[PDB]
Amino acid sequence: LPEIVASGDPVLHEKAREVDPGEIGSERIQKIIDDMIKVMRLAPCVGLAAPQIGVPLRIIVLEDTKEYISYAPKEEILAQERRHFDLMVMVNPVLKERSNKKALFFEGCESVDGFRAAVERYLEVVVTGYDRQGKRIEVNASGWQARILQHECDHLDGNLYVDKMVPRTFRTVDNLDLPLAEGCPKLGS
Amino acid sequence: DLPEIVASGDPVLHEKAREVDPGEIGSERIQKIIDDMIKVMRLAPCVGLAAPQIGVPLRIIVLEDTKEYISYAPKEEILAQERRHFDLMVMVNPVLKERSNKKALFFEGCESVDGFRAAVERYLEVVVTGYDRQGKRIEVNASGWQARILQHECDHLDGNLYVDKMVPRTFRTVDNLDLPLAEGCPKLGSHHH
Ligand SMILES: [Zn+2]
Ligand SMILES: [Zn+2]
Secondary structure, three states, rough: OOOOOOOOOOHHHOOOOOOOHHHHOOHHHHHHHHHHHHHHOOOOOOEEEHHHHHOOOEEEEEEHHOOOOHOOOOOHHHHHOOOOOEEEEEEEEEEEEEOOOEEEEEEEEEEHHHHHHHEEOOOOEEEEEOOOOOOOOEEEEHHHHHHHHHHHHHOOOOOOOHHHHOOOOOEEEOOOOOOOOOOOOOOEO | OOOOEEEEEEEEOOOEEOOOOOOOOOOOHHHHHHHHHHHHHHHOOOEEOOOOOOOOEEEEEEEEOOHHHHHOOOOOOOOHHOOOOOEEEEEEEEEEOHHHHOEEEEEEEEEEEEEEEEEEEEEEEEEEEOOOOOOOOEEEEEEEHHHHHHHHHHHHHHOOOOHHHHOOOEEEEEHHHHOOOOOOOOOOOOOOO
Protein backbone atom coordinates (compact mmCIF):
# COMPACT_ATOMS: atom_id res chain seq x y z
CA LEU A 1 0.00 0.00 0.00
CA PRO A 2 1.17 3.52 -0.77
CA GLU A 3 1.81 5.80 2.18
CA ILE A 4 -0.25 8.93 2.75
CA VAL A 5 1.83 11.86 1.46
CA ALA A 6 2.42 14.77 3.92
CA SER A 7 2.13 18.51 3.34
CA GLY A 8 5.07 19.82 1.28
CA ASP A 9 5.10 17.08 -1.34
CA PRO A 10 4.29 19.04 -4.55
CA VAL A 11 1.67 16.43 -5.63
CA LEU A 12 -0.51 17.75 -2.82
CA HIS A 13 -0.25 21.35 -4.01
CA GLU A 14 -0.74 20.94 -7.76
CA LYS A 15 -3.87 20.54 -9.86
CA ALA A 16 -4.80 16.88 -10.52
CA ARG A 17 -5.59 15.69 -14.08
CA GLU A 18 -8.99 14.33 -15.23
CA VAL A 19 -9.20 10.58 -15.87
CA ASP A 20 -10.37 9.53 -19.34
CA PRO A 21 -13.89 8.24 -18.52
CA GLY A 22 -13.35 5.31 -20.89
CA GLU A 23 -10.31 4.27 -18.87
CA ILE A 24 -12.05 4.19 -15.44
CA GLY A 25 -12.73 0.46 -15.82
CA SER A 26 -9.05 -0.21 -16.63
CA GLU A 27 -6.62 -2.23 -14.44
CA ARG A 28 -4.51 0.81 -13.70
CA ILE A 29 -7.42 2.98 -12.48
CA GLN A 30 -9.17 0.15 -10.62
CA LYS A 31 -5.90 -0.52 -8.75
CA ILE A 32 -5.55 3.15 -7.76
CA ILE A 33 -9.18 3.11 -6.51
CA ASP A 34 -8.62 -0.19 -4.63
CA ASP A 35 -5.43 1.26 -3.04
CA MET A 36 -7.23 4.48 -2.03
CA ILE A 37 -10.04 2.59 -0.26
CA LYS A 38 -7.59 0.36 1.66
CA VAL A 39 -5.38 3.36 2.62
CA MET A 40 -8.42 5.33 3.80
CA ARG A 41 -9.68 2.39 5.90
CA LEU A 42 -6.19 1.75 7.37
CA ALA A 43 -5.66 5.37 8.61
CA PRO A 44 -8.63 5.34 9.38
CA CYS A 45 -10.30 8.45 7.94
CA VAL A 46 -13.58 9.42 6.25
CA GLY A 47 -12.12 10.68 2.96
CA LEU A 48 -9.08 10.54 0.72
CA ALA A 49 -8.04 12.08 -2.57
CA ALA A 50 -5.64 10.56 -5.15
CA PRO A 51 -2.87 13.20 -4.65
CA GLN A 52 -2.68 12.02 -1.00
CA ILE A 53 -1.19 8.74 -2.21
CA GLY A 54 0.95 10.51 -4.79
CA VAL A 55 -1.41 10.03 -7.76
CA PRO A 56 -2.10 13.31 -9.72
CA LEU A 57 -5.60 12.24 -10.86
CA ARG A 58 -9.05 13.54 -10.08
CA ILE A 59 -10.30 10.70 -7.87
CA ILE A 60 -11.83 10.83 -4.38
CA VAL A 61 -13.14 8.13 -2.00
CA LEU A 62 -15.19 8.70 1.14
CA GLU A 63 -17.36 6.98 3.72
CA ASP A 64 -18.71 7.49 7.21
CA THR A 65 -19.75 4.52 9.30
CA LYS A 66 -21.70 3.71 12.47
CA GLU A 67 -18.30 2.71 13.89
CA TYR A 68 -16.53 5.99 13.15
CA ILE A 69 -19.49 7.99 14.35
CA SER A 70 -19.45 5.95 17.59
CA TYR A 71 -16.17 7.68 18.58
CA ALA A 72 -17.91 11.08 18.92
CA PRO A 73 -20.49 12.11 21.55
CA LYS A 74 -24.19 12.26 20.48
CA GLU A 75 -24.22 16.05 20.98
CA GLU A 76 -21.37 16.66 18.53
CA ILE A 77 -22.86 14.22 15.94
CA LEU A 78 -26.19 16.11 16.14
CA ALA A 79 -24.62 19.56 15.82
CA GLN A 80 -22.48 18.45 12.86
CA GLU A 81 -25.37 16.72 11.08
CA ARG A 82 -22.98 13.81 10.82
CA ARG A 83 -24.64 10.64 9.49
CA HIS A 84 -23.48 7.37 8.02
CA PHE A 85 -23.12 7.01 4.28
CA ASP A 86 -21.99 4.16 2.06
CA LEU A 87 -18.56 4.04 0.43
CA MET A 88 -18.50 6.52 -2.42
CA VAL A 89 -15.98 6.67 -5.31
CA MET A 90 -16.07 9.76 -7.52
CA VAL A 91 -13.91 10.13 -10.65
CA ASN A 92 -13.70 13.65 -12.16
CA PRO A 93 -16.01 15.10 -9.49
CA VAL A 94 -17.46 18.58 -10.10
CA LEU A 95 -18.92 20.18 -6.99
CA LYS A 96 -21.37 23.06 -6.66
CA GLU A 97 -23.25 24.34 -3.62
CA ARG A 98 -27.07 23.86 -3.44
CA SER A 99 -27.62 26.99 -1.30
CA ASN A 100 -25.68 29.69 0.53
CA LYS A 101 -26.10 27.91 3.90
CA LYS A 102 -22.74 27.42 5.69
CA ALA A 103 -21.44 25.81 8.92
CA LEU A 104 -18.17 26.17 10.83
CA PHE A 105 -16.48 23.15 12.46
CA PHE A 106 -13.01 21.76 13.13
CA GLU A 107 -11.40 19.74 10.32
CA GLY A 108 -8.24 17.67 10.03
CA CYS A 109 -6.45 15.93 7.15
CA GLU A 110 -4.20 12.89 7.13
CA SER A 111 -1.64 14.94 5.17
CA VAL A 112 -1.41 17.41 8.11
CA ASP A 113 -0.65 15.17 11.09
CA GLY A 114 -1.44 16.41 14.62
CA PHE A 115 -3.51 19.58 13.98
CA ARG A 116 -7.06 20.89 13.30
CA ALA A 117 -8.58 24.26 12.41
CA ALA A 118 -12.09 25.65 12.04
CA VAL A 119 -13.21 25.68 8.40
CA GLU A 120 -16.36 27.23 6.95
CA ARG A 121 -18.09 24.91 4.48
CA TYR A 122 -21.34 24.82 2.48
CA LEU A 123 -23.97 22.74 4.20
CA GLU A 124 -25.56 21.51 0.93
CA VAL A 125 -23.78 20.44 -2.25
CA VAL A 126 -24.22 18.58 -5.51
CA VAL A 127 -21.35 16.70 -7.11
CA THR A 128 -21.40 15.24 -10.60
CA GLY A 129 -18.86 12.74 -12.00
CA TYR A 130 -18.32 9.04 -12.56
CA ASP A 131 -18.49 6.10 -10.19
CA ARG A 132 -15.93 3.31 -9.76
CA GLN A 133 -17.25 1.50 -12.83
CA GLY A 134 -17.27 4.59 -15.05
CA LYS A 135 -21.03 5.23 -14.88
CA ARG A 136 -22.21 8.86 -14.70
CA ILE A 137 -23.51 9.85 -11.25
CA GLU A 138 -24.96 12.86 -9.42
CA VAL A 139 -24.64 13.02 -5.63
CA ASN A 140 -26.65 15.35 -3.42
CA ALA A 141 -25.26 15.67 0.07
CA SER A 142 -25.82 17.75 3.20
CA GLY A 143 -24.24 18.17 6.64
CA TRP A 144 -20.95 16.38 7.35
CA GLN A 145 -20.95 14.33 4.12
CA ALA A 146 -21.07 17.68 2.21
CA ARG A 147 -18.05 18.94 4.17
CA ILE A 148 -16.12 15.73 3.38
CA LEU A 149 -16.94 16.16 -0.35
CA GLN A 150 -15.65 19.76 -0.35
CA HIS A 151 -12.49 18.80 1.56
CA GLU A 152 -11.68 15.96 -0.86
CA CYS A 153 -12.61 17.93 -4.03
CA ASP A 154 -10.30 20.73 -2.76
CA HIS A 155 -7.35 18.27 -2.82
CA LEU A 156 -7.82 17.81 -6.58
CA ASP A 157 -7.06 21.47 -7.15
CA GLY A 158 -3.99 21.32 -4.89
CA ASN A 159 -5.82 23.03 -2.02
CA LEU A 160 -5.46 22.12 1.70
CA TYR A 161 -7.74 23.27 4.54
CA VAL A 162 -4.96 25.27 6.24
CA ASP A 163 -5.14 27.85 3.42
CA LYS A 164 -8.86 28.57 4.01
CA MET A 165 -9.17 28.20 7.80
CA VAL A 166 -10.70 30.78 10.15
CA PRO A 167 -7.83 32.87 11.65
CA ARG A 168 -6.76 32.07 15.23
CA THR A 169 -8.36 28.59 15.24
CA PHE A 170 -5.46 26.40 14.09
CA ARG A 171 -4.55 24.06 16.95
CA THR A 172 -2.99 20.81 18.03
CA VAL A 173 -5.26 17.78 18.31
CA ASP A 174 -4.62 17.80 22.10
CA ASN A 175 -5.91 21.38 22.25
CA LEU A 176 -9.06 20.61 20.21
CA ASP A 177 -11.46 21.27 23.11
CA LEU A 178 -9.98 24.60 24.25
CA PRO A 179 -12.14 27.71 23.84
CA LEU A 180 -12.18 29.79 20.68
CA ALA A 181 -10.25 33.03 21.07
CA GLU A 182 -11.81 36.47 21.43
CA GLY A 183 -13.29 37.60 18.11
CA CYS A 184 -13.55 34.14 16.52
CA PRO A 185 -16.96 33.23 15.08
CA LYS A 186 -18.76 30.48 16.98
CA LEU A 187 -18.93 26.89 15.71
CA GLY A 188 -22.13 25.61 14.14
CA SER A 189 -24.67 27.04 11.68
CA ASP B 1 10.10 25.16 37.59
CA LEU B 2 10.61 26.15 33.94
CA PRO B 3 7.35 26.75 31.99
CA GLU B 4 6.58 24.59 28.98
CA ILE B 5 6.03 26.14 25.57
CA VAL B 6 2.32 26.61 24.99
CA ALA B 7 1.01 25.03 21.75
CA SER B 8 -1.48 26.45 19.19
CA GLY B 9 -5.06 26.16 20.52
CA ASP B 10 -4.42 27.79 23.90
CA PRO B 11 -6.25 31.16 23.78
CA VAL B 12 -3.24 32.99 25.31
CA LEU B 13 -1.54 32.56 21.89
CA HIS B 14 -4.51 33.92 19.99
CA GLU B 15 -5.48 37.02 22.01
CA LYS B 16 -3.82 40.38 22.59
CA ALA B 17 -1.24 40.54 25.40
CA ARG B 18 -1.16 43.51 27.81
CA GLU B 19 1.59 46.05 28.31
CA VAL B 20 4.00 45.77 31.22
CA ASP B 21 3.75 48.81 33.54
CA PRO B 22 7.13 50.48 32.75
CA GLY B 23 7.80 50.95 36.49
CA GLU B 24 7.54 47.17 37.01
CA ILE B 25 10.05 46.01 34.34
CA GLY B 26 12.96 46.00 36.85
CA SER B 27 10.96 43.98 39.44
CA GLU B 28 12.06 40.37 40.34
CA ARG B 29 8.71 39.14 39.05
CA ILE B 30 9.24 40.49 35.51
CA GLN B 31 12.96 39.58 35.56
CA LYS B 32 11.95 35.97 36.36
CA ILE B 33 9.53 35.91 33.39
CA ILE B 34 12.31 37.25 31.13
CA ASP B 35 14.90 34.72 32.46
CA ASP B 36 12.34 31.91 31.93
CA MET B 37 11.76 33.05 28.30
CA ILE B 38 15.51 33.12 27.60
CA LYS B 39 16.02 29.59 29.10
CA VAL B 40 13.01 28.20 27.20
CA MET B 41 14.23 29.81 23.95
CA ARG B 42 17.75 28.40 24.39
CA LEU B 43 16.38 24.99 25.42
CA ALA B 44 14.33 24.52 22.22
CA PRO B 45 16.64 25.91 20.75
CA CYS B 46 15.14 28.76 18.70
CA VAL B 47 15.88 32.35 17.71
CA GLY B 48 12.89 34.14 19.26
CA LEU B 49 10.17 33.80 21.87
CA ALA B 50 7.19 35.89 23.02
CA ALA B 51 5.72 35.85 26.55
CA PRO B 52 2.32 34.29 25.54
CA GLN B 53 4.35 31.26 24.38
CA ILE B 54 5.11 30.55 28.08
CA GLY B 55 1.52 31.31 29.13
CA VAL B 56 2.28 34.91 30.21
CA PRO B 57 -0.19 37.50 28.80
CA LEU B 58 2.41 40.30 28.60
CA ARG B 59 4.08 42.26 25.84
CA ILE B 60 7.66 40.91 26.07
CA ILE B 61 9.86 39.35 23.41
CA VAL B 62 13.34 37.86 23.49
CA LEU B 63 15.50 36.93 20.52
CA GLU B 64 18.98 35.67 19.76
CA ASP B 65 20.77 34.32 16.67
CA THR B 66 24.19 32.96 17.52
CA LYS B 67 27.23 32.34 15.30
CA GLU B 68 26.75 28.69 16.31
CA TYR B 69 23.12 28.45 15.07
CA ILE B 70 24.10 30.16 11.81
CA SER B 71 27.04 27.76 11.20
CA TYR B 72 24.52 24.95 10.50
CA ALA B 73 22.72 26.64 7.59
CA PRO B 74 23.93 26.58 3.94
CA LYS B 75 26.20 29.52 2.97
CA GLU B 76 23.89 30.45 0.05
CA GLU B 77 20.84 30.46 2.35
CA ILE B 78 22.58 32.71 4.92
CA LEU B 79 23.42 35.14 2.09
CA ALA B 80 19.93 35.16 0.59
CA GLN B 81 18.30 35.56 4.03
CA GLU B 82 20.78 38.25 5.14
CA ARG B 83 21.06 36.24 8.36
CA ARG B 84 23.73 37.69 10.67
CA HIS B 85 24.47 36.87 14.31
CA PHE B 86 23.12 39.23 16.96
CA ASP B 87 23.47 39.24 20.73
CA LEU B 88 20.61 38.31 23.06
CA MET B 89 17.91 41.01 22.91
CA VAL B 90 14.93 41.65 25.23
CA MET B 91 12.24 44.20 24.45
CA VAL B 92 9.27 45.11 26.69
CA ASN B 93 6.21 46.75 25.11
CA PRO B 94 7.80 46.73 21.63
CA VAL B 95 6.15 48.82 18.88
CA LEU B 96 7.24 47.75 15.39
CA LYS B 97 7.11 49.76 12.18
CA GLU B 98 8.54 49.12 8.70
CA ARG B 99 11.28 51.42 7.35
CA SER B 100 10.48 50.81 3.65
CA ASN B 101 8.17 48.91 1.28
CA LYS B 102 10.86 46.26 0.59
CA LYS B 103 9.78 42.71 1.39
CA ALA B 104 11.22 39.19 1.53
CA LEU B 105 9.82 35.64 1.36
CA PHE B 106 11.36 32.74 3.29
CA PHE B 107 10.23 29.79 5.38
CA GLU B 108 9.40 30.26 9.10
CA GLY B 109 8.64 27.86 11.99
CA CYS B 110 7.26 28.51 15.49
CA GLU B 111 7.84 26.39 18.59
CA SER B 112 4.07 26.73 19.24
CA VAL B 113 3.43 24.84 15.93
CA ASP B 114 5.65 21.79 16.30
CA GLY B 115 6.69 20.05 13.10
CA PHE B 116 5.77 22.46 10.31
CA ARG B 117 7.07 25.39 8.27
CA ALA B 118 5.61 27.79 5.71
CA ALA B 119 6.70 30.71 3.53
CA VAL B 120 5.79 34.08 5.00
CA GLU B 121 6.35 37.57 3.47
CA ARG B 122 8.00 40.06 5.86
CA TYR B 123 9.34 43.62 5.74
CA LEU B 124 13.09 43.57 5.10
CA GLU B 125 13.68 46.72 7.24
CA VAL B 126 12.03 47.61 10.56
CA VAL B 127 12.38 49.83 13.62
CA VAL B 128 11.14 48.79 17.03
CA THR B 129 10.73 51.06 20.02
CA GLY B 130 10.21 49.88 23.56
CA TYR B 131 12.08 49.16 26.77
CA ASP B 132 15.05 46.92 27.49
CA ARG B 133 15.03 44.46 30.42
CA GLN B 134 16.13 47.21 32.84
CA GLY B 135 13.26 49.48 31.80
CA LYS B 136 15.41 51.90 29.75
CA ARG B 137 13.73 53.40 26.64
CA ILE B 138 15.35 52.01 23.47
CA GLU B 139 14.99 51.97 19.66
CA VAL B 140 16.16 49.02 17.57
CA ASN B 141 16.76 49.24 13.84
CA ALA B 142 16.91 45.84 12.11
CA SER B 143 17.05 44.31 8.65
CA GLY B 144 17.18 40.84 7.04
CA TRP B 145 16.65 37.84 9.31
CA GLN B 146 16.70 39.85 12.56
CA ALA B 147 13.90 42.08 11.18
CA ARG B 148 11.88 38.91 10.37
CA ILE B 149 12.30 37.49 13.88
CA LEU B 150 11.18 40.82 15.36
CA GLN B 151 8.03 40.79 13.20
CA HIS B 152 7.22 37.16 14.07
CA GLU B 153 7.66 37.77 17.84
CA CYS B 154 5.78 41.09 17.87
CA ASP B 155 2.94 39.34 15.97
CA HIS B 156 2.57 36.92 18.93
CA LEU B 157 1.77 39.86 21.23
CA ASP B 158 -1.33 40.66 19.14
CA GLY B 159 -2.39 37.01 19.18
CA ASN B 160 -1.18 36.43 15.61
CA LEU B 161 0.62 33.27 14.32
CA TYR B 162 2.42 32.82 10.98
CA VAL B 163 -0.05 30.15 9.81
CA ASP B 164 -2.69 32.85 9.29
CA LYS B 165 -0.44 34.95 7.06
CA MET B 166 1.44 32.31 5.03
CA VAL B 167 1.74 32.04 1.24
CA PRO B 168 -0.85 29.45 0.06
CA ARG B 169 0.44 25.97 -0.85
CA THR B 170 3.74 26.35 1.04
CA PHE B 171 2.74 24.83 4.42
CA ARG B 172 4.89 21.71 4.92
CA THR B 173 6.35 19.27 7.42
CA VAL B 174 9.93 19.97 8.60
CA ASP B 175 11.02 16.77 6.81
CA ASN B 176 9.61 18.12 3.53
CA LEU B 177 11.15 21.59 3.99
CA ASP B 178 13.47 21.25 1.00
CA LEU B 179 10.93 19.90 -1.49
CA PRO B 180 10.20 22.04 -4.56
CA LEU B 181 7.61 24.82 -4.43
CA ALA B 182 4.50 23.99 -6.48
CA GLU B 183 3.52 25.96 -9.56
CA GLY B 184 2.04 29.37 -8.92
CA CYS B 185 3.94 29.75 -5.64
CA PRO B 186 6.24 32.81 -5.54
CA LYS B 187 9.97 32.03 -5.35
CA LEU B 188 11.82 32.59 -2.05
CA GLY B 189 14.06 35.66 -1.83
CA SER B 190 13.86 39.43 -1.54
CA HIS B 191 13.08 42.62 -3.48
CA HIS B 192 16.24 44.28 -4.96
CA HIS B 193 17.96 46.53 -2.34
ZN1 LIG C 1 -7.46 15.96 3.33
ZN1 LIG D 1 6.54 31.98 17.17
